[PDB]
Each structure stands twice: as structure tokens, then as C-alpha cells.
Design a protein around this ligand. Structure first.
Ligand SMILES: [Cl-]
Ligand SMILES: [Cl-]
Ligand SMILES: [K+]
Ligand SMILES: [Mg+2]
Ligand SMILES: [Mg+2]
Ligand SMILES: [Mg+2]
Ligand SMILES: [Mg+2]
Ligand SMILES: [Mg+2]
Ligand SMILES: [Mg+2]
Ligand SMILES: [Mg+2]
Ligand SMILES: [Mg+2]
Ligand SMILES: [Mg+2]
Ligand code: NA
Ligand code: NA
Ligand code: NA
Ligand code: NA
Ligand code: NA
Ligand code: NA
Ligand code: NA
Ligand code: NA
Ligand code: NA
Ligand code: NA
Ligand code: NA
Ligand code: NA
Ligand code: NA
Lengths: 65, 194, 46, 56, 81
RNA sequence: GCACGGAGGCGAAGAACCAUGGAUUUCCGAAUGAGAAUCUCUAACAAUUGCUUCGCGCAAUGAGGAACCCCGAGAACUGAAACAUCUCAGUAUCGGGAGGAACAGAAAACGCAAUGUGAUGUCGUUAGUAACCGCGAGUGAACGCGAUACAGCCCAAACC
RNA sequence: AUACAGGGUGACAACCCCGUACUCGAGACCAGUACGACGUGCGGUAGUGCCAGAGUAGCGGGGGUUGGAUAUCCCUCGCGA
RNA sequence: GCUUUACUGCAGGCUGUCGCUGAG
């Protein structure tokens, strides 16, 4: 959602990897707030981050890296 | 006039007389120390070989196969069996030694398929037959009009389905007339009565 | 008796399946875990 | 010493375990062969025509 | 590609080790060796790793006990997440 | 998703849903580097073959599938009012294998004997006829006709 | 009404909704088949004993199988054009 | 199920002969 398709393609081979490692870290700091019984969650997002990483990797392979 | 082949073919009409007999008595000695399935470089019976499908090409293989002589190596019945089914010695298989040879061979060379076969002697305790196999995955043969068909999928593991020449002969499918009632088009569709 | 890294996982799954159906699925279906395995009364595999 | 109740007490040897191939608890760890799928004995799944009626 | 660190194990016991011993407990993939656990930790939180103790849980996962050098403070690291 | 809660999110950047093509696709598994009850140990077509730059370089096999199909191995209860040939029955079961269908197939055929027909299946009939059988119980075709669908070919050798 | 098949819908529905008839489109199968085109060359006479598949045709002994009777098909032993 | 000089068989042992199998 907060990250669309075209945009993933407009990036350079290095930006996908940079953004991927940015989201991977947010998703990782997400599972920690949850594993900590945390309540300030926003359920839709922890789901999105997963689907975003899919979209990014899906495109990485599509562009030849 | 007579071809060179016609000599080899004639010599083999009586393998017990002349030079061939002097030859058999020799080779056989070397043949008895050899394994069951041995790949030889050239057909012993060049004529017969060619007349069966042989060609000096890439993907055409020949091999000799030795089998024990005898009758049904049938084990005796352990449970109750009436007098008639009590056989072990006498009864023989419904599959001839030549055909057994073709299979031992096709197996030894999985990827290859069996063209044909032929006898090459026998002593007091074994019989030999040579076997012509073909590599249906080799372009030489896929392109060779005269052998092309053997590549067809529905030709795979043919020797095992009795599709050989020696197979149809064993299945009683020689004569298109009298006697073939119970064999054509197949033994199983005739309830196995031949 | 000693166990393997693998067996130890199987046992674990076998224990997680042994939990009750969430009180919330109750309300969502508007209305029973048929695979409740007691330790003494029942026997797992292996 | 009866073969019954009293001889049930020694039964603490392990035999048929979870077969890696078919997923049954029929892998005889002393023979390393499955009683169900045949894994360990045949490359082909063990199957017999008598696991069902004749005309079926 | 599999991730080494799954998430921080937060429990009454985990806190104890963290407070009085400067230890961080984790939830990690079961193929991840002590050595691997080490690296991924130093890399993810920027610290110096002393020792790692592993254990395969009755929860299908592996549990990593990682101790940070006398230079870094555990309580401070686990709080920013 | 079933699955109708709670919180939250997604959708006019046209989501859901559907169709087609593509990506990803853990470990065991023919399971193939080697070992193992789904995990482990230090680069791999393991094994058997074929072609071979004779280097696993290029390839092949393996195993699954409701039943059908093809080649092999082949019962007994039962019927015969007992029972041994015979029957059940080439049935059940077992071994090996192919395809989408298999198999068979272009006469060293038929033999309504003819001045005749003209590859092979299959359907109908011939026919429970001929033939077999402690001539007991029981087993049991073909040519032919009428239909369906049709289609005909290639080596070996002579001579180069 | 070329549509009174069937279903849904708070009771028995052609006309409330899905559909039904009519017409149309797409895939798959038929099938890389039918037809067409390209090359190759069909056939015929006279002469010539140059060529045409062997443990085969076939015989005998022993088993089996078949409706196959002497006259089914197969296997094995021995002999063999 | 067992038995035997019950009926019919079968392995098995003994034996002639055939082939393997040749020289004076
Ligand atoms: Cl074959
Ligand atoms: Cl006629
Ligand atoms: K009987
Ligand atoms: Mg430990
Ligand atoms: Mg392995
Ligand atoms: Mg009886
Ligand atoms: Mg009776
Ligand atoms: Mg048929
Ligand atoms: Mg009678
Ligand atoms: Mg019969
Ligand atoms: Mg007739
Ligand atoms: Mg009979
Ligand atoms: Na083969
Ligand atoms: Na027969
Ligand atoms: Na128990
Ligand atoms: Na967890
Ligand atoms: Na998939
Ligand atoms: Na391969
Ligand atoms: Na190689
Ligand atoms: Na009776
Ligand atoms: Na009786
Ligand atoms: Na007539
Ligand atoms: Na009789
Ligand atoms: Na004979
Ligand atoms: Na008894």
C-alpha cells in the first residue's frame, strides 16, 4: 500500500536492496514489539511489510537483479 | 555372384563341421570365463546381424549373453497341490531361452532398446545369443530412416512387452492362419490359451 | 530415553495441536477440538 | 508366568517408528524397513492387489 | 533465504539474565550455529559478542543466550526496540 | 478462505474474484556425494549405460497414475452330488513393462474348391454349430456373411 | 413467449432475481490430420540357373496348452533341408 | 493331524542310454 509497483521499478538495483534491508529491519522491530506482548501494533502493517518484501524480491528477479 | 556375407551364413548352417567347428571349440573356452552380459565390438554373424537390422553406425550396439541350460528351475509346492500340479523337474517355462537373453541384456543397458537377437552356439551347459541394441536418444539413429521408429515412446522397453521378433515368434503369432485363433491380437485378450 | 533434534520437533508440534480452539473462533463461527491428546490416556506415534 | 497380563510388563522395546518416506509409524528401527510403504526394501511404494476386493 | 534472528525472547527469566548478567536471549532458526548467531547479533545491534549458549526448545525453535562484552549494556540495547 | 469475534488494514494508483502465462517454491521422498525413523557429515548424475573433445563433457534409465493394455509366474475352496483326469481357471494372487490408449497388421492367408475372397482390430451372426471330455460334469472355436474404420509401406542381398 | 427447463425469493412465481429460447464469441479435441504445393520417378518387352532371412523348414522323445480331434499353440532334449 | 505292505502321485537315490565329447 504505502509502497506501489511502478515505484519499485523506478528504483536502481542498489535502491531495492537498500529499501529491502530497511523494511526487513522494520518487520524485525515489529515482531519484537509483538513478542513483547506489545499493544501499540497496527495489524495491517505487519502484514503489508511481508507483502512488500515479496513485491521487492519479485521485482529484483524480474529486472535481472 | 555370392557376397562375402553368404559365406559366413553358409558356414553357420552346420557349426559342427569344418573351420567354424574348430572356431567354436576355441572361442567357447574364452566365452565360459566371460561374464553374462559382455559387450563385443563386432557381430560374430555379420550376415545375420545385417539381415536383422545391423549397421556400422553410432548408437548401434551388439552383445553376447550366456544362459544356464535346462528345464524349469521350479520349486516344489509347499501347500496342498493335486497330483497334476506336483511338477518340478519336467515342466518347462513358456518363454524360450533366447528371449530370456534379450531381457538380461536390455536391462544391462537400460537406455538402449532391443532391435533383434540371434544364436551363436551352445555347449552342454549353456547357450549363447548375440543382441543388437540401439540408442534411441542418439541423433544418428533419430535421423536414420531405416531405424528411426525405435525412438518412438511406444517402443520403450519393448523386449519386455514381447514386441521383439523373437517375442512374436514365442507368442505363437507366426501364421496369419489356422492355429492363431488363440493368439491374435494378444495372449491376454484370448484368456491365455496358447 | 534419548531423542533426536527431529523427534524433539515432532513432539513439540504434537503438543501445540493439543491446545484448545480459541474462544474467539467460537463467536466467529457462531458455534470442539476433535484431536485432544492426553499424555497418560493417549499415545502419540514413535 | 502367563503370556497375558504378566508378560505385558516387559514390553518396552522400540520397533515401528515414523517412516521418513510414507509418514507412518511403521518403520521397524531394528530392520530399517517400513511395513506400510516398504521404504528401505523397495524403491517402489509397497502396494498389493489384496488391500481391496477382487473386482475393485 | 532464511533469517537467523527471528525475534527477542522477552520473559521474566530473560530479564534477570539481562539485568544482573548483561545477557540477551533470542528466538533463532534451528540451523543457525552458535557462531552464526554471534555474527548476526553483532551486525544487527552493533556490539561485541562474548559467548553464545544455544538450546533447542520444546516449541520447535532454538533459543540463543548471547552475552555482550563488558563494554556494552544489555538493558539499553533491548529498550530501543 | 471455511469462519457471522475483536483490533486493524486493503480498494477509483480499479482491490476482491476469475482466466491464462510467470516468480517464489523449506526438509523427506525414484532421492542420486555420504550417512540417517523428515536430520547430519566433508563437493557430487549415486548406480547402470550410451556418444565421447575419454572431462559426467553431452545424454538416457529409476519413481507415481482409477482402471484399461502388453509379456511372464500361476492357486484352492468349489462343481463332478465321494474322488485322482476334468471343473473352479489361465480365474485369484505375484514378477516386469508401455501408452492415452495398448496389442495386432499388409498373407510361405483363406479352401462357401472357386472363373472365388484379399492387412489387423472390434460389433452382430455363423453357434452352443464343428471339435474336446472318468464321452460324466461340463469346455467350446474358424472360414463366411452383415457392419464399423480403412492404407500402405521399409530393409537384407544381387548391381554400384 | 424462437424464452411455460431448472433454481432463488419471508407460502403454489413465464412476467421479483438467477437463468431458459434466439444470435454471438473463446479455448480445447478432431489435427501438423484432410486438401494443396515441392522433389523423386510409375509401367512395359527379350535375354540372364547374378540376388531373396538356418540350428530355421522339418523329424523323433518328454512336458504343457488348445475346441483342435493324427488335424491348436508353446517349451525342452536330440536329429536336421 | 498322524500311519501304513490303502489308491495315485512327487522329490530323492541307484541305473542304462542321448548330448556336452576330442585323439589311436
Ligand atoms: Cl527393450
Ligand atoms: Cl470370401
Ligand atoms: K482338484
Ligand atoms: Mg546444547
Ligand atoms: Mg541422500
Ligand atoms: Mg477338494
Ligand atoms: Mg465336490
Ligand atoms: Mg486387443
Ligand atoms: Mg461322472
Ligand atoms: Mg479351459
Ligand atoms: Mg476357416
Ligand atoms: Mg486342458
Ligand atoms: Na532397455
Ligand atoms: Na495351446
Ligand atoms: Na502413553
Ligand atoms: Na514463537
Ligand atoms: Na507451487
Ligand atoms: Na541422468
Ligand atoms: Na564422463
Ligand atoms: Na460335491
Ligand atoms: Na470328502
Ligand atoms: Na455365402
Ligand atoms: Na477328461
Ligand atoms: Na520336440
Ligand atoms: Na489335526
Amino acid at each position: 500500500t504505502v509502497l506501489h509497483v511502478q515505484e519499485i521499478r523506478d528504483m536502481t538495483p542498489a535502491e531495492r536492496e537498500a529499501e529491502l534491508d530497511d523494511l526487513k529491519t522494520e518487520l524485525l522491530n515489529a515482531r519484537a514489539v509483538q513478542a513483547a506482548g506489545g499493544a501499540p501494533e497496527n495489524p495491517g502493517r505487519i502484514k503489508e511489510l511481508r507483502k512488500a518484501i515479496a513485491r521487492i524480491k519479485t521485482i529484483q528477479g524480474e529486472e535481472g537483479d | 555372384a555370392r557376397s562375402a556375407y553368404s559365406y559366413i551364413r553358409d558356414a553357420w548352417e552346420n557349426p559342427g563341421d569344418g573351420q567354424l567347428a574348430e572356431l567354436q571349440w576355441q572361442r567357447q573356452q574364452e566365452w565360459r570365463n566371460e561374464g553374462a552380459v559382455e559387450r563385443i565390438e563386432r557381430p560374430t554373424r555379420l550376415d545375420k546381424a545385417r539381415s536383422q537390422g545391423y549397421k556400422a553406425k553410432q548408437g548401434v550396439i551388439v552383445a553376447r549373453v550366456s544362459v544356464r541350460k535346462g528345464s524349469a528351475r521350479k520349486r516344489r509346492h509347499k501347500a496342498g497341490r493335486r497330483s497334476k500340479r506336483q511338477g518340478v523337474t519336467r515342466i518347462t517355462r513358456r518363454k524360450d531361452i533366447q528371449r530370456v537373453a534379450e531381457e538380461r541384456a536390455s536391462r544391462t543397458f537400460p537406455n538402449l532398446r532391443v532391435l533383434n537377437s540371434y544364436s551363436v552356439g551352445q555347449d552342454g551347459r549353456q547357450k549363447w545369443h548375440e543382441v543388437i541394441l540401439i540408442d534411441p536418444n542418439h541423433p544418428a539413429i533419430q535421423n536414420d530412416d531405416d531405424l528411426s521408429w525405435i525412438c518412438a515412446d511406444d517402443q520403450a522397453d519393448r523386449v519386455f512387452r514381447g514386441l521383439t521378433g523373437a517375442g512374436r515368434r514365442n507368442r505363437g503369432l507366426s501364421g496369419k492362419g489356422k492355429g492363431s485363433e488363440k493368439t491374435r491380437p494378444s495372449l491376454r485378450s484370448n484368456g491365455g490359451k496358447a | 530415553g534419548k531423542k533426536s533434534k527431529a523427534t524433539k520437533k515432532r513432539l513439540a508440534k504434537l503438543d501445540n495441536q493439543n491446545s484448545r480452539v480459541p474462544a474467539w473462533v467460537m463467536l466467529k463461527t457462531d458455534r470442539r477440538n476433535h484431536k485432544r491428546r492426553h499424555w497418560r490416556r493417549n499415545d502419540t506415534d514413535e | 508366568t502367563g503370556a497375558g497380563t504378566p508378560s505385558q510388563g516387559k514390553k518396552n522395546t522400540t520397533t515401528h517408528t515414523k517412516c521418513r518416506r510414507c509418514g507412518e509409524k511403521s518403520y521397524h528401527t531394528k530392520k530399517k524397513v517400513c511395513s506400510s510403504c516398504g521404504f528401505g526394501k523397495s524403491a517402489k511404494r509397497r502396494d498389493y492387489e489384496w488391500q481391496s476386493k477382487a473386482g475393485e | 533465504s532464511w533469517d537467523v534472528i527471528k525475534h527477542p525472547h522477552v520473559t521474566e527469566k530473560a530479564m534477570n539474565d539481562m539485568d544482573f548478567q548483561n545477557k540477551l536471549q533470542f528466538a533463532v532458526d534451528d540451523r543457525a550455529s552458535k557462531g552464526e548467531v554471534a555474527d548476526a547479533v553483532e551486525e544487527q545491534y552493533d556490539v561485541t559478542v562474548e559467548q553464545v549458549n544455544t538450546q533447542n526448545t520444546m516449541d520447535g525453535e532454538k533459543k540463543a543466550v548471547v552475552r555482550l562484552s563488558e563494554d556494552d549494556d544489555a538493558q539499553e540495547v533491548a529498550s530501543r526496540i
